[model samples]
Target: MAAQGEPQVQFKLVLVGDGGTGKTTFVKRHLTGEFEKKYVATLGVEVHPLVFHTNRGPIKFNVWDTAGQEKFGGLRDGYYIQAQCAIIMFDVTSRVTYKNVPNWHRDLVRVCENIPIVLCGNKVDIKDRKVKAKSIVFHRKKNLQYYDISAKSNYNFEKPFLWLARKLIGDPNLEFVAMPALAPPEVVMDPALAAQYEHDLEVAQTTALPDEDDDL
Candidate 1:
C-alpha cells in the first residue's frame, strides 16, 4: 500500500535567486507561517513541498531553494529541469541582484525549457527613498509577475503561490486571478489547513521558533 498523503508530482516549485536575495526567508515563511526578518544567504538547494489531495488526485510540489553564490553554480542546473513554476527573486536594495536576471533567466530556460516563471523583488520593508539604492525599471520590460515585498512585511508574498495554483487548475478562477495588485497576500487551501501546515513546518525547522540567533 502507498504511504499516506504522498504527493502526485515529484517536484512542483522552485526558488532561484542571487545570494542574500531572501530565498531562505521565503521558504521559512511558508513553513513557519510567519513574517519575520527573512534573508540569510542560502548555501544550496533547500527542498520543500505542499501536497494537496483533491477529488481529482494529489498535487505535490518540490520547491527547490538555491544559493545565489557563484560557488553554488553547479547545484542549480539539476533542479531546474523538473520544475513547473519558478520564482526568481532579486534584492530591491541591490543593483547587482537586478542585473543578474539575464543570467538567471538563461539558466532557467536551459533547464526548464520555457516553464512558468515569476520575478520577485525582495526587501520591500525598506520602501522609503533612503532605503532604495536601486531601481526596478528593468523589471518593467518583462512580462513576468514582479513582486516587491519584504520577508519582514510578508506583503503580497502569496501571489506566486496563487499563480501556480491557478495554472494548475487551468485558471478556473481567472476572474479573481486577473485582479489588479494588492490581492490578499496569502490564500489558504483552507483556513484550518493553512493553520496546520504552518504548525507542522515550524516543528520541522526548529530555527523557526522566535530567537535572537535566527534573527541574524
Candidate 2:
C-alpha cells in the first residue's frame, strides 16, 4: 500500500474509442477514495485521475476519456497531446467498432509518437460477440499489445492498465502492490467461456494471418 506522503508520479493516459465502447466504465472500475477527481476538459473529453498503488509508489494516470462521437467538432488532436500512453477500445459485439480501430490508432500515433498503446476489445462477456479473438489482427499488424476486456463483468479489466504501466515504467516485472476498492461487477463471466477465449487467443496468435482483410 502507498503511504499518504509517498512521492507520486503522473502520466497522461489517453482513452479513445467509438461511443458506447465502455471506455468510461472501464476507467470508473478503478475508482477509490483517492481516485474521485474528475473534470470535463475544454473539449468533450473527461479527465479522470486514477491512482494505482504499486511497489514503487502510487502512480497516477490522468486518463483522458474522449467522447466517441464528434458532434461538438472539438479538436480531437488536443486530447492526445502529451499522452504518455493510450488505450484504444472497441466493442467485440459490434463489428463496425472494431473496424474503426485502425483510424483511432492512426490518430493517436500522429500526436503521441512512440507511446505505448494497448488495443482493447471491450464487452467480451457478451454472448453474441461479432469480433472473435481469431479475427483480431489489427494489434498484431500495428505492433501493439491487445486484450479482450469486459467493463461490466470485470473480465480482464486491469490487464490493459498493467500492460501500459509495465511499458511506461520500463519494467517487465512490474506488478501492482495493492489494488483500489472497486465496485462489484454487474455481470459475472462464465469460467468455461473465459477459458475458451483464452485458448482461442493463443491459437489465433500462432496461426497464419488471413489473406484478405476481412477482420478489418
Candidate 3:
C-alpha cells in the first residue's frame, strides 16, 4: 500500500517469450525471491503484482506472464491488449528460441502499438550460450533496450523493470537509481570483467556484481 502523499504510478507489465525461455521462472523469482527448479508451462496469463519503493515514489507493477505454446496463440492478443509495457524474452541457449523473437515482438506490437518493449535474453548461467554478442545491433535499430539475465540467480533482474519505470514515467534520473545492480553499465571500462560480459554491455550489457562468480 502507498503511504499518504506519496506519488504512486501503477502500470501493467507483460512478459512474452517462447516456451521454455524461463518467462514463468523469471516472474516467479521476481515475485517470490526464490528460484523454482520445477518447470510448468503457463496456461494463458498468470498475474502477479510487484511494488517497488523507488527514490521518485512507489510504483506498482501489475505483471502478467503469458503462455508461449502454439495452442495458446489465440489467447495472446487478449493478454497483450491491456499491457502498457512488455519484455520480449528469448532463451540464450536455444538458437531456435532466439530466432523466433521477432514474431513475438511483432505480435506484441500489433496489439499494443507504441508500448515500450524491452528485449531480454534469458538463461545466461550456462556456459554454452548460443546467442552471441553483436546481435544486439538489430535491437538497437528497433530502439529496444536489451538485457541478458539469469533469473535463477537474480542476475540483472531489477534493471529491466527499472528501465521500464523510467521509460513509462519519463524519468531519466531514475536510471540505475532504483536498482543499480540490475541496471547495465553505461561505460564498460574494466578489462578484466569484459571477457565474461556480453552485449556492447548491451543483453550482453550485464555487469557482474561482487560474488557473482560464486552464484554461478
The collision pairs in model 3 are: 148-203, 198-204, 199-204, 201-205, 202-205
- Once model 1 is optimally superposed onto the true structure by TM-score, how far is the C-alpha of residue 20 displaced, in angstroms? 0.9
Least well predicted 10-residue stretch by lDDT in candidate 1: 172-181
C-alpha TM-scores of all predictions:
0.66, 0.73, 0.76
Model 2: worst 10 consecutive residues (lDDT sum): 33-42
For residues 1-216, write the lDDT of model 1, one tens digit per residue.
124224544435778888887888777776656544434566656777655433435555568887777533446677776678888888877778877876887777777666667888777666332224255554455556666666656667677766665666665453232223455646646755556667556555654433322243
Structural RMSD, model 3: 12.6
Q: Each candidate's root-mean-square deviation in Å? A: 9.1, 13.1, 12.6
lDDT of each: 0.65, 0.75, 0.76
Candidate 3 per-residue lDDT over residues 1-216, each given as its tens digit: 353222467788888889999988788667655565557688878888777767786777888888888533545677887789999899888989988887887787878778888888887777777897566565876778989888866778888999898988887777443444466568757777666444233322232332424444
Counting clashing residue pairs in each candidate, in order, gives 2, 0, 5
Judging by TM-score against the true structure, name the best candidate: 3
Q: Candidate order by lDDT, highest to lowest?
A: 3, 2, 1
